[PDB]
Amino acid sequence: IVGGYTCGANTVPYQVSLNSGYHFCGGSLINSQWVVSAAHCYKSGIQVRLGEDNINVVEGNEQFISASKSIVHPSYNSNTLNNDIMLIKLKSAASLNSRVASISLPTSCASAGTQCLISGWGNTKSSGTSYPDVLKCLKAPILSDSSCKSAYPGQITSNMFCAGYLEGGKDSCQGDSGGPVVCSGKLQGIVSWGSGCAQKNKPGVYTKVCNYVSWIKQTIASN
């Protein structure tokens, strides 16, 4: 996250870190057994780390649970990043508490102008590279589809939305991928892609979670 703020420990209780020996992507806890992340984060050998603040220090609220199964969306296209969503099942159920909590799925899509919370452990610099140990946060609005499509000609599908600031300076970044965009208490986006980070006229692009609620629910119901 570039241009954000330190969230505070366990203030984003649905945020998970995906770990394969190191943090590599975010995700969102949606029930005691399941995490939503980006399909481009897929890899084998995932450990889900819940209850994290400093990802390099054991602080006392963590739960580390191996993934038993990951399910990339049936129509994910890695070239275009269309349908950039996956589900990860935990080998054991998380113990839910005030610091480890699921986030609700949306019932309808969000609208341009709605202010959302984006979080992660990704790069905090737009030029250069600095990875934080503690969780970072950014409040940002959803942008109109027309402005999104104008910013990225030929690239924005109906399964994507833009959020952030056209002036630059405030965005998600590499290492935030797969993490949450939460608006009014609902998971509306997944950190997906962008041109660089925090660049003028190049806002963040996010997977449009509302389009996937039926798939999510039916997948959980049979897995």
Which residues contribute to the site for Ca ion (CB under 5 A)?
A: 52, 54, 59
193 CB contacts (<8 Å, ≥6 apart)?
Answer: 40, 81, 84, 177, 204, 205
175 is in an annotated binding site: yes
4 vs 8: CA distance, rounded Å: 12
171 is in an annotated binding site: yes
Do 94 and 65 contact (CB within 8 A), yes or no? yes
- Tell me the β-bridge partners of 36: 28, 87
- Which CB sits closer to Ca ion, 52 or 84? 52
153 CB contacts (<8 Å, ≥6 apart)?
Answer: none
- What's the closest the beta carbon of residue 61 comes to Ca ion, in angstroms? 8
- Which CB sits closer to Ca ion, 101 or 213? 101
177 is in an annotated binding site: yes
- Tell me the β-bridge partners of 199: 202
CA 53 to chain centre: 16
- Which CB sits closer to Ca ion, 19 or 33? 19
CA 70 to chain centre: 16
- Tell me the β-bridge partners of 16: 27
172 is in an annotated binding site: yes
Do 102 and 14 contact (CB within 8 A), yes or no? yes
Which amino acid appears at position 92 of this protein?
A: S
Give the active site residues: 40, 84, 177
- What's the closest the beta carbon of residue 80 comes to Ca ion, in angstroms? 35
Q: Which of 133, 110, 104 is nearest to 120 (CA)?
A: 133
- What's the closest the beta carbon of residue 133 comes to Ca ion, in angstroms? 9
- Which CB sits closer to Ca ion, 10 or 102? 10
Binding site residue list for Ca(2+): 52, 54, 57, 62
Annotated binding site for substrate: 171-172, 174-175, 177
Binding residues: 52, 54, 57, 62, 171-172, 174-175, 177
